[PDB]
Design an enzyme around this catalytic site. Structure first.
Site, PDB file in Angstrom:
ATOM      1  N   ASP A 139       0.833  -1.204   0.000  1.00 48.83           N
ATOM      2  CA  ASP A 139       0.000   0.000   0.000  1.00 48.83           C
ATOM      3  C   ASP A 139       0.867   1.254   0.000  1.00 48.83           C
ATOM      4  OD1 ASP A 139      -2.472   1.303  -0.084  1.00 48.83           O
ATOM      5  OD2 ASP A 139      -2.631   1.439   2.137  1.00 48.83           O
ATOM      6  N   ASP A 167      -3.213  -3.251  -2.391  1.00 49.14           N
ATOM      7  CA  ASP A 167      -4.241  -2.218  -2.546  1.00 49.14           C
ATOM      8  C   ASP A 167      -4.050  -1.454  -3.837  1.00 49.14           C
ATOM      9  OD1 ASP A 167      -6.481  -0.777  -1.768  1.00 49.14           O
ATOM     10  OD2 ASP A 167      -5.309   0.756  -0.731  1.00 49.14           O
ATOM     11  N   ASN A 168      -5.122  -0.866  -4.325  1.00 47.26           N
ATOM     12  CA  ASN A 168      -5.022   0.124  -5.396  1.00 47.26           C
ATOM     13  C   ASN A 168      -4.575  -0.420  -6.716  1.00 47.26           C
ATOM     14  OD1 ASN A 168      -3.747   1.961  -2.726  1.00 47.26           O
ATOM     15  ND2 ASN A 168      -5.831   2.381  -3.641  1.00 47.26           N
TER      16      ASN A 168
HETATM   17  O1  LIG Z   1      -0.472   7.015  -2.945  1.00 45.02           O
HETATM   18  C1  LIG Z   1      -1.096   6.123  -2.296  1.00 45.02           C
HETATM   19  N1  LIG Z   1      -0.425   5.365  -1.405  1.00 45.02           N
HETATM   20  C2  LIG Z   1       1.039   5.516  -1.197  1.00 45.02           C
HETATM   21  C3  LIG Z   1       1.315   6.634  -0.205  1.00 45.02           C
HETATM   22  C4  LIG Z   1       2.819   6.956  -0.186  1.00 45.02           C
HETATM   23  O2  LIG Z   1       3.539   5.820   0.264  1.00 45.02           O
HETATM   24  C5  LIG Z   1       4.935   6.116   0.416  1.00 45.02           C
HETATM   25  N2  LIG Z   1       5.480   5.061   1.190  1.00 45.02           N
HETATM   26  C6  LIG Z   1       4.913   4.659   2.439  1.00 45.02           C
HETATM   27  C7  LIG Z   1       5.741   3.724   3.016  1.00 45.02           C
HETATM   28  C8  LIG Z   1       6.880   3.524   2.126  1.00 45.02           C
HETATM   29  C9  LIG Z   1       8.041   2.774   2.117  1.00 45.02           C
HETATM   30  N3  LIG Z   1       8.930   2.891   1.074  1.00 45.02           N
HETATM   31  C10 LIG Z   1       8.608   3.696   0.037  1.00 45.02           C
HETATM   32  C11 LIG Z   1       7.526   4.561  -0.092  1.00 45.02           C
HETATM   33  C12 LIG Z   1       6.639   4.378   0.978  1.00 45.02           C
HETATM   34  C13 LIG Z   1      -2.533   5.978  -2.455  1.00 45.02           C
HETATM   35  C14 LIG Z   1      -3.209   6.869  -3.275  1.00 45.02           C
HETATM   36  C15 LIG Z   1      -4.562   6.792  -3.499  1.00 45.02           C
HETATM   37  C16 LIG Z   1      -5.299   7.752  -4.361  1.00 45.02           C
HETATM   38  C17 LIG Z   1      -6.412   7.373  -5.132  1.00 45.02           C
HETATM   39  C18 LIG Z   1      -7.086   8.241  -5.987  1.00 45.02           C
HETATM   40  C19 LIG Z   1      -6.577   9.540  -5.975  1.00 45.02           C
HETATM   41  F1  LIG Z   1      -7.253  10.445  -6.771  1.00 45.02           F
HETATM   42  C20 LIG Z   1      -5.515  10.001  -5.225  1.00 45.02           C
HETATM   43  C21 LIG Z   1      -4.832   9.072  -4.442  1.00 45.02           C
HETATM   44  C22 LIG Z   1      -5.334   5.801  -2.847  1.00 45.02           C
HETATM   45  C23 LIG Z   1      -4.632   4.933  -2.000  1.00 45.02           C
HETATM   46  O3  LIG Z   1      -5.344   3.943  -1.321  1.00 45.02           O
HETATM   47  C24 LIG Z   1      -3.217   4.961  -1.828  1.00 45.02           C
HETATM   48  O4  LIG Z   1      -2.683   3.995  -1.005  1.00 45.02           O
HETATM   49 CL   LIG Z   2      -4.611   2.563   5.496  1.00 45.03          CL
HETATM   50 MG   LIG Z   3      -4.082   2.405  -0.681  1.00 46.64          MG
END
Ligand SMILES: O=C(NCCCOCn1ccc2cnccc21)c1cc(-c2ccc(F)cc2)cc(O)c1O
Ligand SMILES: [Cl-]
Ligand SMILES: [Mg+2]
Ligand SMILES: [Cl-]
Length: 213
Positions: A139, A167-168
């Site tokens: 995620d 997810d996603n």
């Molecule tokens: O961007 C999303 N998730 C990622 C977060 C950064 O994560 C960075 N990150 C966190 C630990 C980690 C460890 N290593 C590298 C990067 C690492 C994410 C985005 C959307 C979404 C859906 C529609 C939209 F219009 C806009 C956004 C929905 C979701 O459910 C998501 O999960």
């Molecule tokens: Cl979450």
């Molecule tokens: Mg997500």
């Protein structure tokens, strides 16, 4: 303050300490009624719950904690002594997640790691005393699903039957990951169609069960 701080304060003021289900409800109410946020949400969360209950994993790795919604959701269903490790690159969100887990009374089940997956995955065996993982929840950055799946395998962290749950896979989407696991004899894949958290927008989870090399 930030949205993430507002979500934590809402939980603190609208949920019951030590009651994970109240914490999930409070997050979902806030994010429905006040401000959208990227928590997995209750629609996809109910599919995660069914998967967690089917496999009763002893050791789970989460990539991407955010505010701890998915960490609360999974840790509340873990058996006694089972553990979740959750990686979070953003230190502010790591601190919110720790506080969310504290509030829910789940802090003895979860270890919140603050760094990048590509740095931390190679340290899991020696530093966090991991042998193999039972389950992985993906995620984090969507373009990292595939490289981190391959890095997990390189590191010897997968075993026959490790469950990847992603997810996603539809929105924002992870097209390279999907094509790879669906095409690979090393994975057995199932798609669970659902909705983007808090929205009437189609999304889904992919389950990809590792079958060895
Ligand atoms: O961007 C999303 N998730 C990622 C977060 C950064 O994560 C960075 N990150 C966190 C630990 C980690 C460890 N290593 C590298 C990067 C690492 C994410 C985005 C959307 C979404 C859906 C529609 C939209 F219009 C806009 C956004 C929905 C979701 O459910 C998501 O999960
Ligand atoms: Cl979450
Ligand atoms: Mg997500
Ligand atoms: Cl939802």
């Amino acid at each position: 303050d930030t949205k993430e701080q507002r979500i934590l304060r809402y939980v603190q003021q609208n949920a019951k300490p030590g009651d994970p289900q109240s914490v999930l409800e409070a997050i979902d109410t806030y994010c429905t009624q006040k401000e959208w946020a990227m928590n997995v949400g209750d629609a996809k969360g109910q599919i995660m719950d069914a998967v967690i209950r089917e496999y009763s994993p002893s050791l789970v790795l989460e990539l991407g904690a955010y505010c701890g919604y998915s960490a609360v959701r999974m840790a509340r269903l873990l058996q006694p002594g089972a553990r979740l490790l959750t990686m979070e690159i953003n230190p502010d969100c790591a601190a919110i997640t720790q506080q969310m887990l504290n509030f829910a009374g789940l802090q003895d089940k979860v270890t919140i790691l603050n760094g990048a997956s590509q740095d931390l995955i190679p340290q899991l065996k020696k530093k966090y005393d991991v042998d193999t993982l039972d389950m992985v929840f993906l995620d984090h950055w969507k373009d990292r699903y595939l490289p981190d799946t391959l890095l997990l395998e390189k590191c010897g962290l997968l075993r026959k039957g490790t469950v990847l749950l992603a997810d996603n896979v539809i929105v924002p989407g992870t097209p390279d990951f999907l094509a790879y696991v669906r095409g690979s004899s090393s994975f057995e894949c199932t798609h669970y169609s659902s909705y983007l958290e808090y929205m009437k927008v189609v999304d889904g989870l992919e389950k990809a069960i590792y079958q060895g090399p």
